[PDB]
Design a binder for this molecule. Sequence first.
Ligand SMILES: [Mg+2]
Lengths: 67, 114, 104, 55, 98
Amino acid sequence: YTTPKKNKHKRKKVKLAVLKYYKVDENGKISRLRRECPSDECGAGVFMASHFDRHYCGKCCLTYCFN
Amino acid sequence: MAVQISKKRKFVADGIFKAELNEFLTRELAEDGYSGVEVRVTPTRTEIIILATRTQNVLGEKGRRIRELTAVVQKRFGFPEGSVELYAEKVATRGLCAIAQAESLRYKLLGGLA
Amino acid sequence: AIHRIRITLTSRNVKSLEKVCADLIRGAKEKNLKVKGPVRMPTKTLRITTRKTPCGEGSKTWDRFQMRIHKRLIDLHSPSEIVKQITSISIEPGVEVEVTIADA
Amino acid sequence: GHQQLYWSHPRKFGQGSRSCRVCSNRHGLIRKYGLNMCRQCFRQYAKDIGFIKLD
Amino acid sequence: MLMPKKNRIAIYELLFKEGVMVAKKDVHMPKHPELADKNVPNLHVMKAMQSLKSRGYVKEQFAWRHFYWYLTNEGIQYLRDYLHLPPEIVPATLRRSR
RNA sequence: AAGGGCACCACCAGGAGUGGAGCCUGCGGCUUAAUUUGACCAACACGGGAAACCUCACCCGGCCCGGACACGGACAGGAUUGACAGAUUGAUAGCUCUUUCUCGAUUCCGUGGGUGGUGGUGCAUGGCCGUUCUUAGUUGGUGGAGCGAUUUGUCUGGUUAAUUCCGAUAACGAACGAGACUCUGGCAUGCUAACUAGUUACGCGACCCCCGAGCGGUCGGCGUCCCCCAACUUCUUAGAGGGACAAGUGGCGUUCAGCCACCCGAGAUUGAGCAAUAACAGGUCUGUGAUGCCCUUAGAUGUCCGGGGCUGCACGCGCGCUACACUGACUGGCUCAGCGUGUGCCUACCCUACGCCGGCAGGCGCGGGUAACCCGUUGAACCCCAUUCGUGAUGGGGAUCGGGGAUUGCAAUUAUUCCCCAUGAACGAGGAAUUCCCAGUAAGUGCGGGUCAUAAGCUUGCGUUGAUUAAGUCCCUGCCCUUUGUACACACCGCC
Ligand SMILES: [Mg+2]
């Protein structure tokens, strides 16, 4: 054997806690702080990603780019 | 015509079906005194007759096992539904069948007789 | 219906082919349908030559396998209807039968 | 990996597109008359198919 | 096997409707032929039936390139309480016209 | 060592050759990251092994689990799975990193335990196959002989392809092998049958002769199972039957078994298949979901993907192809086959008529055929008939090599194949050696199948043309039987 490369470290997920990325104010006023994927396959339930320079839909895999 | 294959390929496919069915029945009904298989094919329907010594054993509880094998041979080769019938026939003079006697000898040797 | 039919019988063995081509036409004569004579098509000889050994070591002996397919044609022609008259086939395992009409 | 490279290599033809219908071997196949059977498996089963020796 | 519910229950109900099921040995087969509308890969159905064999609810027979799985009496009640079915509907091989 | 018999895997008389040249291909060697590997009469165009990917088993890298099941942790406040962008990578492998979304109990971690393996072991094995050996050999029961291993049966002789038979006979009665058997080829104007085969006759036609023929000649032109609107099976097909038996004659023979010659006859010896006891450390674990044991099993010897390799070259050998030319090459014309295949479960990839474009390889539309219906009356080659060449490495030979054009494929470079134009290298019949063969045979010659997306210098079959020599022998190489010798018994490749 004697592989020249070291053992490839397999990816370990970030182990995210409870999501809680939406907030209401003054005894309840809804505020989506995340973008919504508008496709039928994504639906109105799931939330899109809020990447620092685009938005990604978890199901629809649509990426909306803002320049 | 175009839908039906030529006679050469049709006869070869019939032989392939016979061989595959015989191998399946050998590997499945080995402990039940399997002797042979005979297929009578007609355009209307087909009849598969399993020559075996222990008919009451190849036929399960109220024909459960023969129904199972009928469904298996239905699904594997894709006959039209209700176009294949499987019967079990007891062989005559089982001492003259080399298949049955070889299977019995194999059973005895696996049991552990000298 | 006014019908004219063709029945072709094909299998691997001459004994069963001959006995079918005999009993069918005898039934036709007893059932007074005039018979176009049995036509024996040339035999199809499927030949496969394969090396005997499973290894490739030896004296290069070849085993040749043959499959003889024989087929016969009988034309049933009657002034009246044919299919409603003849319904029984009396076909043993091994032989394959195909019935067409003059249109096909 | 994923579905885009697991089986992406074409096998619409060639020796790797064909295998024995009995033992899944890829050498010494017999495709004549649509047999699709290995050289050894055909000798094994020729009695069952009906290919018998005459000369 | 990472195969989901939407095909696990499909395979299980196919296996319960008739006491047998036949699967050609082809892990690369894109689609198992019957239940053509469920998008169930042959690898998934093969490994599901293999797990059932290991747990003892189905017995396996192997011809040339096929599995011929036969569901067992130990598989009867496991399929029944996995699919949440009262013990009144039976597989096809069990009861016919009676 | 003797006696008898036999074999073109022996010779004799010969034929074609091989060994000499070029090339193809398979081994060894060399080189390499790898040039995967088995096999050394009975290995070396063998593993149906003509490998671009796959095949693939080798090398260089990269993914995935396709690690069942049980138990314990882990957990819906989330076990865990995918994925856009940037880097990263060969890669549009979310493979890893930054980044946040998303599946939801299917999985994750640990321990036992699977499973898979073209990994090892054919000197652990099965099956198959090769060889001893396709020679004629092999065995029991009861009886006889021997203390017994054993022996007789199973043989002095004649005869046969054959322990094949006649005969003798301490053996009698059997069994296998041989033979018999099956397929195949040859004759059937005898039978049955034919619009998926035809023939004859007749009728429409088309052309020549028309001097005048005229029931003149040609037609693979159209018709007569289009159903009343001809018959028949010689030709073709395939079934049942017949036929050949040393049957008849002469000679030889113990006048037996049989042998020789001849008549009549299609045939007086057609080729194969099957094929005994006992064996081999013969070959295959790289055919198998045949398989014991051992090895590996998550950084895989599993599996998938990309690239390379199996082709690599101072050299040696084997099976072959092309030739060395005039008994020929080129050019044109004429003219004849038979095997057999053809559209796919997965599986995509069939044989092709005709028309058009192109010089060719090819391309473009129209069809036919799942087939005695279409390719196809398989217009094959050799050969035959005329032309040019003229004894020169020449119009012999076409290796090597350059440029260009198509086809297959996802991909043609280390050129897949094909086409065109240039280059005409060795080679002037081949040392010592050595192979195969007795009649439709050798040889010349093409055509099918297998391999095949592309394809044959291979192999398995088919047809065409068609001989020289021989009807013997044990001389060489071997084989069988009997006697004999042996200090061999792993058996003369012994022993010493
Ligand atoms: Mg020239």
